[PDB]
Amino acid sequence: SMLKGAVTALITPFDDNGAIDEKAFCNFVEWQITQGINGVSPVGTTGESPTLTHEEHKRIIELCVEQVAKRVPVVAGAGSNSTSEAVELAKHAEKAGADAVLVVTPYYNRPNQRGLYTHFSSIAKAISIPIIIYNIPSRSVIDMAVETMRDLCRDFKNIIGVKDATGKIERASEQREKCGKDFVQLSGDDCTALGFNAHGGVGCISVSSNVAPKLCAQLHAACLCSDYKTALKLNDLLMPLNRAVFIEPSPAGIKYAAAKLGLCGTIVRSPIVPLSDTTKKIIDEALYHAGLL
């Protein structure tokens, strides 16, 4: 019931040595809130969860929860391709005060639909707070079928929605039909988020909103009230950025953008690396198009 509109997949700012910059993080979360973001999602993919330790993951969530002071929902990443690790991560996120967890389909080991059911069901039984399934075939190769999604949301009261990063907007409809109008569908793809909403989504767990939280929340508020005229005008401001920040592997591009706005430094953890100067120029053009410079 809480999750709709623009929800930022928070970057995790690092210092010159690659250590977490806590102050930059907290100042970034405050800004996101005062700019009008409708929710935040710490320690996901965009937050460099693959290269964070368990201790860092906990700490970032703790800081994020404390800085937010309940003003907006906190949907923390708790993803792994190991079910027992995902269980431990979701439990930590709950202890650290998260309002829900975002849990990706296991990547690399390519489980089947029964494997997906065992994975998400084990997590669901281990915690009390709600779970958003993060379906992303472009990264995990496998894909959670709608029927599996239905089974999980029907069998567990705390499995309540999806971050649909398929960018295949027809899925929004099938999911609405088979999981219900009550199934909370958030886009996981800025590039198709507008169309996603038209098909039944109610917002986006966003990358671009790291640097444009106001415009993103405006676009999604426009969608929530059925003002698609305004939504299409805003989309047009954002699309070039939406694309540009995925030219090179994320979050190199969204971090450079934040950095251009003075929000953090550009440092990322290997195998994520610095942008080439061509990509930098293209992000600059896109930021200018959006009115952010």
Add this chain to the structure above:
Amino acid sequence: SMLKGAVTALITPFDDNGAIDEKAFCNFVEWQITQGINGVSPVGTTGESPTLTHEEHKRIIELCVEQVAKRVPVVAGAGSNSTSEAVELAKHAEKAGADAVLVVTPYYNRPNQRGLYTHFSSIAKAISIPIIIYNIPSRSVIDMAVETMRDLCRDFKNIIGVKDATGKIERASEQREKCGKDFVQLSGDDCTALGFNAHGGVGCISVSSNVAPKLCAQLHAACLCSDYKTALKLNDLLMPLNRAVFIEPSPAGIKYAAAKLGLCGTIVRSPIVPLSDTTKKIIDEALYHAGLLK
């Protein structure tokens, strides 16, 4: 330019021997028009252009044009993976009274962007009427890049638009930005048509509108009037059908649906073949969901 809304990718009704059912076709087009369709597209892929002869292609266009009598636009298929054949087909479509031609990206031979430019430019130079580019990677493999699209509609006044069947809604945005708001965007994919419109589309060259031309015409009008609450309600009625007519190779599904409504028979030309019983049942239930069967 005035080309907007629901435009049916018309099926070609066959009789029991696989010959053109010319009566059923003319009656179907009339029904299409009285049901409120905003345009029709004869002899495209859904019309089994792969298995039609040159003489059939010509004839069906003629009958479509005579029946339609300029009440709505007729956008005839003139696709081939041979530039010189595509040119000849387009010329035939124009001579037969077509208002525009629908031209697929060459398939099988996998040309590059240069090849695509040469293909479409040779066609545009050969006729006066408008051309809509039919980008469909899922069938042609290759994909006309947005920069090729923009270049073609810059260099030729009569290349005006796209039937975008990529089903990747972000392309509507990039096309709008780089080809202009003038550039006519129509979805070629009923399953993502709603969202396509949200990103900038002005309608859809539809398969499902063969059997639901009123609902589809209404869905797109809803989008055209920017009433997206109504559009979504109508989308929910149509979506199961939209999917179900693509479980097996098209247009077996759509023709079966048309059959159940008495619009035509179910015969298709090989390698298109009859549905399995399981697909018939899914299409039946989808048609009840849409309220097309009562």
Add this chain to the structure above:
Amino acid sequence: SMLKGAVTALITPFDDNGAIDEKAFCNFVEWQITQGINGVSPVGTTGESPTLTHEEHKRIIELCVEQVAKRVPVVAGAGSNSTSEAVELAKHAEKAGADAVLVVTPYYNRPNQRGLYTHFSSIAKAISIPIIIYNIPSRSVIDMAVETMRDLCRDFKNIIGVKDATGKIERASEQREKCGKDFVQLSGDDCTALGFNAHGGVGCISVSSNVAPKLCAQLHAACLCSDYKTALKLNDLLMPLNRAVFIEPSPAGIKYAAAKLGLCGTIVRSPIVPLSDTTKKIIDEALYHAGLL
């Protein structure tokens, strides 16, 4: 049985106007034979089948059959995505003296396995001479399943083999196993042909043999005699040329290579177009590495 070794996917030389150059075609076919090619395949993809008329298709086959004078097998292309058109193309090939036909999986309309069965069975019932199945998902999208091949070669004594252009060498094993050791398997991919013979192939319907008929004949002979040390070394000479003539859409590349050896001019039919200079330099280096100029 005589379908083994190197079989050239013949180019169709055109004059400056794009008309068939009959005299260049006949001379090229003679040269192919004298250079030791084990067979020829007119009017397929490499011969620009998509952009030839029915009359041109018949004529090229006619000239090829006449020139070859039974010295090697002629496997004529008779492909289409219309069954009725493929049937007529096969009947013309047979009437023109072809020893077999090469029939591709329908492209563009994406038939299912039942449609594929209907399509090939129709052709098999219309002609007496053998049919080789041309499986090439990279151009047709659909793939003929091994079960379907197996079914077709059980039910029709004149469906005898495959031009396997999948580039997935494991398929040669499954095909060998389920269609039989008697099923004639030939590679449709020069780049993987050596390996495909290892798994059970007995040759290749080749693009590279257009310009390297002797070396390709030598390599597949090595394979046929089970001399793989020699085959690997001949491959080392051919691989750059094998890759290079696919950098741009074929047959622009193979035609340019033939032009460089004085065998024909470079004209192709739209939408196939002239090569860029980068590509022509790369082909030149490949031809030089092979010892062909």
Add this chain to the structure above:
Amino acid sequence: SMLKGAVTALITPFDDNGAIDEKAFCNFVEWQITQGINGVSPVGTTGESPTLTHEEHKRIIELCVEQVAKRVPVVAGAGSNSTSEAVELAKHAEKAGADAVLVVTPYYNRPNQRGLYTHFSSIAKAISIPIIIYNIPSRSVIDMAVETMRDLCRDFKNIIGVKDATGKIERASEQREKCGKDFVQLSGDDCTALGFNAHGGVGCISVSSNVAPKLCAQLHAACLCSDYKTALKLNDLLMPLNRAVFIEPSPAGIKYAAAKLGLCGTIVRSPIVPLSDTTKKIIDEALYHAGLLK
């Protein structure tokens, strides 16, 4: 240079609670060796590395090293999508007595060629023993370009080769040309290993060799001395099992197969799950076909 022939990507036996079954593991390694395997690779993908803890990872390598007693090379898995993690895994592997490490292209985060260079270089600098590159786009999505392979083997003496799981045999030829004939090339795809050796491979880091270590070793020795008649004959015995052990997600298939030979139990850790009966039947059939059951 001693890295040739059939090298088993070792499964990791678990007891009924999913804990490491250590006696099963040690007995299995012993069996692999006496059956004539040419090397072992513990705590890789087939050994369920994604679901092992660092402490388990360390223990399985220690056991494997002690059990092998230098009779054959031990190529320990040290894969991660985090560079700092892979670095630490590679160090424990070395400190545990591995002769080499097997390091997969980072998965999920989809790095570019420069990120791959940074990832692999950092590992090379942190250890002394050799590194084999595990290229597997079917799981990591990204591919390590051949130029990138070349750059790493040029700049680092201890990066010496590839476990090539692309299944695209032309890569063997390209890698042979550009990285050197000294570059060590092992197939990571039992289904294409035969042809991979023909194009220049010198072995295979194998899943099927878990249950057929002798037959697999025989096939690769046949290739190593260029007896491809024999190679093919042994390939025809194994191919059905090579496919079958991947119908469902690995190592569910190969462990069932191993349980059918009394080598371990069928327990795997989620999200890996037990086989359905349809796959079990197919695996039985292919075991009978290879002569491993009568």
